[PDB]
Each structure stands twice: as C-alpha cells, then as structure tokens.
Amino acid sequence: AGLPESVIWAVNAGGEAHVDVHGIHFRKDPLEGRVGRASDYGMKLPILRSNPEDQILYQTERYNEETFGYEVPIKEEGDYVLVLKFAEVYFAQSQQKVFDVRLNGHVVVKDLDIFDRVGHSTAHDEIIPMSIRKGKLSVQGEVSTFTGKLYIEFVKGYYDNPKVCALYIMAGTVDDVPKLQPHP
Ligand SMILES: OC[C@H]1O[C@H](O[C@H]2[C@H](O)[C@@H](O)[C@H](O)O[C@@H]2CO)[C@H](O)[C@@H](O)[C@@H]1O
C-alpha cells in the first residue's frame, strides 16, 4: 500500500491536526488534559532541516517531570515501523536533556541527547522497525508476549525532562519510510 494508506496511527503531540507533505494525518493529541504538559514555546522559532510547511509538528511538544507514555491498539499481525519526531527548542549544549525510550519495557533508544545529535531548533527522527506474529512482539533482536496493546514510554532520568513532538506507525519495512535529509 502507498504511504497514506499504510499509516494505522499518528499523533501531533501538544498540538492540533496537521496533514504533512506526504499526505499523513497527524491527529490532535489524545493526552490533552491528561498526563504530561503541552507546550507551544517552539512556535516562535524556525525549525531547521524540516520541510518548512510541516514545522508545526516540531514547534509543539508534550513533556513531563516524571515518566509518561502512549498506549496504542494494534489490530492485525504483520510488519510495522514506528517513527518518533523530536526537536530541542530550549538548550544548546550536550548533557543537559537526556532520556531513554522504551517499548513494552524494551529499551529501544538509550541516552537520547537531541541537541548532541542535531543542534538547537533542528529536526531529529528515530526509526524503529518491529514485527508482530505468533503472539509475540519482536524489536531490536528481543522478544516478548503481545496482548493487543503497545506502550511507548519516555523515561525520566537525571538530566532534565523527557519529551516528544510527533509520532506515527506504518505497515511495511525500513526501506518504505521517508528519511530526513543528511545533516552536519
Ligand atoms: O516549554 C519550553 C520548555 O519547558 C521545559 O524546560 C524548562 C526546563 O526544564 C527548566 O530547567 C528551565 O528552567 O525552564 C525551561 C522552560 O520552562 C521543558 O523541559 C522543555 O522540553 C520545553 O521545551
């Protein structure tokens, strides 16, 4: 299936609905008024590396002073890819904001430091392939029992607060995913 038709779930964290240049609908945040805190602080800033018509995805965020996450229903078995979108709109040195990302307890991104990877006010994406079959979730060479729900959590450590800007899940494999442009 083509790109829009292969997307099963998508969220603009801290924000309203937005359709991107590929035709992907990022839904308004389902955690509005629940756990965590929405912030539109980045709406004053140009976001480098991103396509300019889609900067609003990176200018809005959900963050928290304690661990938080999204629960996702997955209705059918198959191959999927999770894409997570981030920007650092406050700090401009390394080892200021650092956090882990977990999927059903598996650590899938260890010690993410957005500024160290891309700089200030610049797009950074993590691309995480997974498979659901025979009653199991498989991700990064690890395996556990799958019950129908995926729990995506952003873990509070010692260096400032975990955050996310947007996220989506598509059916397919890694070669099917649009990539950000190479960046210094
Ligand atoms: O909404 C802007 C940012 O707010 C928080 O950053 C805090 C930071 O944790 C604190 O140490 C400092 O004194 O103030 C800033 C701004 O309130 C979030 O942690 C960031 O992710 C947000 O971008």
Side-chain angles (χ1 to χ4, degrees):
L3 203 39
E5 292 74 32
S6 57
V7 174
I8 62 157
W9 191 93
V11 165
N12 185 20
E16 295 172 13
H18 181 77
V19 184
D20 87 347
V21 294
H22 310 96
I24 306 180
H25 169 197
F26 292 81
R27 279 65 159 185
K28 66 177 178 176
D29 192 349
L31 288 185
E32 178 203 1
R34 305 281 182 291
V35 66
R37 325 185 158 269
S39 174
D40 66 356
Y41 181 79
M43 284 185 65
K44 212 166 262 183
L45 311 179
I47 304 293
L48 305 177
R49 194 186 179 190
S50 171
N51 202 296
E53 295 92 357
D54 297 333
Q55 297 171 72
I56 188 69
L57 296 174
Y58 296 94
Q59 298 173 321
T60 52
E61 71 189 285
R62 183 162 297 278
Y63 77 91
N64 204 38
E65 289 182 54
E66 296 168 356
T67 297
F68 77 102
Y70 289 87
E71 196 188 62
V72 183
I74 312 291
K75 295 319 226 93
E76 304 285 354
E77 299 209 314
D79 309 312
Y80 298 94
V81 186
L82 167 68
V83 181
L84 301 171
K85 298 185 169 287
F86 308 93
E88 177 60 72
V89 297
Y90 192 76
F91 296 105
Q93 302 180 88
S94 77
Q95 294 216 327
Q96 309 289 294
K97 177 195 293 292
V98 187
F99 59 95
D100 288 355
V101 180
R102 295 195 297 234
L103 196 66
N104 285 17
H106 307 267
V107 175
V108 297
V109 187
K110 176 166 163 73
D111 293 328
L112 174 58
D113 183 342
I114 300 157
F115 173 84
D116 198 45
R117 302 285 286 282
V118 296
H120 182 72
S121 202
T122 304
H124 171 71
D125 292 10
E126 298 279 342
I127 299 172
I128 305 158
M130 68 174 66
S131 191
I132 297 174
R133 193 89 65 191
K134 300 300 187 194
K136 297 302 191 200
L137 170 72
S138 303
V139 60
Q140 279 171 189
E142 296 175 8
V143 182
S144 58
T145 302
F146 193 73
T147 81
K149 303 287 199 53
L150 190 80
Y151 194 42
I152 311 170
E153 77 194 302
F154 308 86
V155 180
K156 179 71 174 86
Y158 279 91
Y159 291 98
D160 203 75
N161 302 320
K163 71 171 282 173
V164 70
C165 296
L167 59 157
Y168 76 96
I169 298 174
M170 57 183 285
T173 62
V174 66
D175 285 347
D176 299 319
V177 182
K179 313 299 194 298
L180 295 182
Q181 64 183 298
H183 178 256

